[PDB]
Design a protein around this ligand. Structure first.
Ligand code: NI
Ligand code: NI
Lengths: 494, 492
């Protein structure tokens, strides 16, 4: 092989693509166009009110501010990597000499969008959606040979005896629909839903996992880490294939700048969650310092944490302590992350590298695990947080049940509903339908129209795309919007 | 005579970097600035102060707006630097090793451009000033001591024969009635949050150069830079040191500011229109017609009509994508060109115009967006009601804390020192409710004073009022509203 980043940092687009030879400048302007597209997308503002950890009530992080923090850390790691590469006289050799700006920016924006796909109430929205679609589709009963009391409630998707091609499609659909995941939904959102038409490189930095959502069974040994969670849905399959071709990815391989983004997320996530914890008066700073000292056991802790504490004891103490905790943490981990990226650059470039930059038995990872431990033991277990998670789960389950009658309809009927807009014998599901976002309905019409109308696959694909539509609509909501819809449609408030 | 090494100053007020530095070490310093800002509570507090509409999610907040402005500022900065490189002027102006810093300072100046604003924005302003006017009446201190001086504070009332003390009284009364977002921003970044930014960075926040205590007309040659107050009587010393570190003449301004300002103008106009359509006030076609009518190969044809033609994904999104893109592709180059064309004056910090404020077609496009906005959006009864409400809320909080300002020096001082005073239950608890940061700022400032001087009661009262304004202006919309409701015993 060889490391030529010109072959990875691909400034083409899916639609209306830039063509031909380009100035270093023209390339830069393209990736800046990407920045504009993202910073101005509704998806991002929607982040400015999805909950991070605490109920919104102002100084507490939201998905947005967290994403901005991650962006900053990503920038710092990218800059350290590029700078070390310049000191190693390796920048030209790796084809990065005219792509430093793009490199940096792709990382920054990949960070900003790392949460773009998450549904309201985060991992509990996820939980709610998957659990609901599991109770309706039971993918576990499609694992092997057709079960004679197949628990799935959808006639079309139930495994029928003798028709193994159709049965395989049924299998994939049922598994896929029960594996909604923030990142996969993120790819879907950026491409099919918002139609942002980013550069291939930029979309690549969003693809954080490489397992198909419809995946059943164990993951390959050699790819365990990159396939921890679903990375793309059955729908984006074609798209993801083209993406692989444009970014020179082997199957289940990942874009490199992703590894960078990931590391940034880990760092920011840990430290910030602790600071917010102190801000919500859960524990004082001293209490935090003791929990850390105890949960640990010239070492790293001494440097980062104990020096942060000593600085803190000689502006406001909470702010001083956390300023220097952040600073010291970053000054230890960011160089390490950079060093790991470079040391492992062949594998990371290939996109096959089966570890995180930080996931280790290295002291650095242990520091991160320390923050995460204190967080999960003394913050995420707090009754107000837990209550909010419970509530969110009820709200999303509730909405899904409210729109159930859209998924109850036969192909004939639902299609009639799409075409006539307002159906006389179907008042409720007509109005339920109108309540779906035009963006999402459009995506449905678009996807269904591209189908072989007479093929036996059609009812299956249609049902899939219809469920896909409903999940699009729900996952697209902010916490407050989802909660509010739930309350109004339950006729609890006007 | 343009040496940007003399403006892009990487020193700090406290614990400053000293000596010779690598281009890299300089970069790392300005990145440290970025970190300090992006992680400051002030910025998240922006993620819920209202921009135009009530929070209810797709609508802009002070934060998202600030991010949009940041992007436009970055683009303008890059265009300026790039045009300077094409003119072979980059080395000559001392920017060849400061391109990263240049860009970054602009970006962050943008992100912080709203950091100072009080809850409910210009109506919080209104409320604060109007309240302190009813209490201090600066208009009665304009000239010679008035014998029925309407001011209700014994110490600050103009007394006959004592013209030095009278001048101090004059400045204090005028200053306290001229609370302004930007001045409060300087105060916030420096005295309150103690962020200790670089001088250059603080400089990009200083948008106006008129002292808050200014009375009478502004100089002819500086009319534009002194439209609004830029710094309070307290930050006076600080601002002086800032002038020395950034090589500013009196009432002169930092350059990168002009850039930030232009970014604000652009993204503010376009965005407000988009959000207007999102809140279903008018459709896209309705908007296009309001624009076409309110106008009159020209610019409109290019930017707006081409946006509309492209528009005919979702139509609202397509139209606004290309409206934003075309607008930027016209105005950002122009802004850059204006910055460079006028670089001597802008560098000096004396340039008496905005990059965009003109009779130039570009400014007219902006004025067009602003006109359609102010006529068909800001006049919408729901916006107006929110402004009215906000003014009531801030006026209400100020009245609620009034008894802290009613106390004598002796008594209020006793309150500060003993923390809980037995004969003063209410004002004790009111006092405890003030943020420790703000109270600390008060103690800090008062302790530095000549304890026996006749100026002391005056300065103390000033700093006390300063304290209360710090606390109120520091709130988010929702927090201020909520405090007003709870302290009125309307909700538990
Ligand atoms: Ni995250
Ligand atoms: Ni603004």
């Amino acid at each position: 092989a060889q490391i030529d980043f010109r072959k990875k940092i691909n400034w083409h687009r899916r639609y209306r693509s830039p063509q031909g030879v380009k100035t270093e400048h023209e390339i830069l302007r393209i990736f800046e166009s990407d920045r504009g597209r993202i910073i101005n997308s509704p998806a991002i503002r929607r982040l400015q009110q999805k909950t991070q950890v605490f109920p919104l009530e102002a100084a507490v992080r939201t998905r947005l501010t967290h994403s901005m923090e991650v962006q900053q850390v990503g920038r710092y790691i990218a800059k350290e990597i590029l700078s070390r590469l310049k000191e190693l006289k390796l920048l030209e050799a790796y084809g990065l000499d005219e792509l430093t700006g793009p490199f940096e920016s792709i990382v920054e924006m990949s960070c900003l969008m790392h949460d773009i796909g998450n549904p309201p109430f985060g991992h509990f929205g996820e939980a709610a959606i998957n659990d609901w679609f599991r109770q309706r589709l039971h993918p576990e009963d499609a694992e092997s040979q057709p079960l004679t009391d197949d628990r799935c409630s959808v006639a079309a998707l139930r495994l029928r005896d003798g028709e193994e091609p159709l049965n395989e499609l049924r299998r994939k659909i049922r598994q896929d629909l029960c594996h909604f995941e923030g990142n996969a939904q993120g790819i879907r959102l950026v491409h099919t839903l918002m139609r942002m038409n980013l550069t291939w490189a930029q979309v690549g930095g969003i693809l954080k996992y490489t397992r198909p959502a419809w995946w059943r069974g164990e993951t390959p040994e050699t790819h365990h880490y990159l396939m921890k969670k679903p990375g793309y849905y059955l729908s984006e399959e074609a798209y993801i294939a083209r993406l692989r071709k444009e970014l020179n990815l082997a199957l289940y391989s990942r874009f490199p700048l992703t590894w960078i983004m990931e590391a940034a997320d880990d760092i920011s996530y840990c430290v910030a969650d602790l600071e917010d914890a102190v801000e919500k008066r859960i524990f004082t700073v001293e209490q935090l310092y003791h929990h850390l000292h105890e949960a640990w056991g010239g070492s790293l802790f001494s440097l980062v944490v104990e020096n942060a504490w000593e600085k803190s004891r000689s502006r406001s103490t909470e702010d001083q302590f956390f300023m220097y905790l952040r600073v010291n943490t970053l000054n230890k981990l960011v160089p390490y992350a950079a060093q790991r990226f470079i040391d492992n650059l062949p594998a990371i470039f290939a996109g096959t590298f089966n570890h995180a930059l930080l996931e280790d038995a290295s002291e650095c990872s242990d520091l991160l695990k320390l923050y995460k431990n204190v967080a999960v033991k003394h913050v995420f277990s707090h009754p107000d947080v837990e209550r909010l998670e419970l509530q969110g789960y009820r709200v999303i389950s509730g909405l899904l049940e409210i729109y159930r009658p859209l998924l109850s309809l036969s192909l004939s009927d639902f299609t009639e509903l799409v075409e006539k807009e307002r159906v006389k014998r179907f008042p409720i599901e007509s109005r339920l339908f109108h309540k779906l976002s035009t963006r999402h309905r459009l995506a449905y019409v678009e996807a269904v129209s591209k189908l072989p109308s007479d093929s036996p696959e059609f009812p299956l694909w249609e049902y899939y795309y219809r469920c896909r539509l409903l999940q699009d609509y729900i996952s697209g909501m902010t916490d407050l919007y989802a909660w509010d819809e739930y309350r109004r449609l339950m006729a609890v408030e006007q």
